[PDB]
Amino acid sequence: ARDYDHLFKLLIIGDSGVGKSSLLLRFADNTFSGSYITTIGVDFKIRTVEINGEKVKLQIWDTAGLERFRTITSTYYRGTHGVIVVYDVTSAESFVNVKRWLHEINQNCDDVCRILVGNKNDDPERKVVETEDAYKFAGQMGIQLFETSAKENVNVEEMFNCITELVLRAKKDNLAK
């Protein structure tokens, strides 16, 4: 018996600059700074949500995207229930690299929920990863995709609620009727 009814670890991964920390701050504090502060090692937020009469505590880990500033890889993945994989819809490279991030998950995790996030969807003139192409890819991987803007606060709450429900469902599907 604890303060929460369920505890889940969520891990945010993806290339440097794509908006991982910004998505986390928007969800956690409803703020967006506009400034870029490079994540060194790891950062985190702990937040609770109420779902179907139960308190769910989210321990949300935020990785450094730059290899130079990452710690030992197994530290990020250990105990993870859900992984949030982020690219930047204005950066083709960040989307190309999604398959590398998916490989990293597979080398470190046996059985986790996943969600794909195309962030910075707030400037049509600089968008290079088209919605349809991203959804097609997501479909082939069997993973849900959300296109978000941490800056404009679009689909951030929806994305975090989705991966929360996925991990809750994964847990409950293994418990009694």
């Binding site: 604890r2 303060d3 505890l7 490079t38 060194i40 090692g41 790891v42 950062d43 985190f44 702990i46 505590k57 321990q59 450094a64 130079r68 500033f69 990452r70 710690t71 030992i72 197994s74 530290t75 105990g79």
Partner: protein, 159 residues
């Protein structure tokens, strides 16, 4: 001057001489008024030895006691990149929120140094603080996280 003998032997990783100083009545928390009120445990940090830090803590050293610039053992270990000493101090209840007289805490120092390993230990220890404050799945094993990190960085200015 048994305190001074202990102080010197701590830098020098000399546990028998440390023990001898203690047997003669050295204060394990002796402050050297001639050298910024630094302590045996701060000397142990500067000397780079983990086992010397352990010995002092086992014999009653205050893990938080500061020099005259307001810098404790954890501050100094962070500045020198002594990852193993940072891990030990965090597990022994060191106050990582302490700021020195210039207003800096260990996390700000580690972030400015872009030190992934030490930032990771400091942040995961904070996560444990936050998990506890709301009141193992709830408890990060930072030793396990430390166990495959480098114990130090010899390219950093240190011994």
């Amino acid at each position: 001057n048994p305190g001074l003998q202990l102080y010197r032997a701590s830098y020098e990783k000399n546990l028998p001489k440390m023990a001898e100083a203690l047997a003669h009545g050295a204060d394990v928390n002796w402050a050297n008024s001639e050298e910024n009120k630094a302590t045996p445990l701060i000397q142990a940090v500067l000397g780079g030895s983990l086992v010397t830090c352990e010995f002092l803590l086992q014999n009653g050293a205050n893990v938080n006691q500061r020099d005259v610039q307001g810098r404790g053992p954890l501050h100094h270990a962070t500045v020198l990149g002594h990852t193993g000493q940072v891990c030990l101090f965090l597990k022994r209840g060191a106050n990582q929120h302490a700021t020195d007289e210039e207003g800096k805490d260990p996390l700000s120092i580690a972030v400015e140094a872009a030190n992934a390993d030490i930032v990771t230990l400091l942040r995961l220890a904070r996560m444990n603080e936050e998990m506890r404050e709301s009141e193992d799945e709830t408890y990060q094993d930072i030793f396990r996280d430390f166990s495959q990190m480098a114990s130090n960085n010899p390219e950093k200015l240190n011994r």
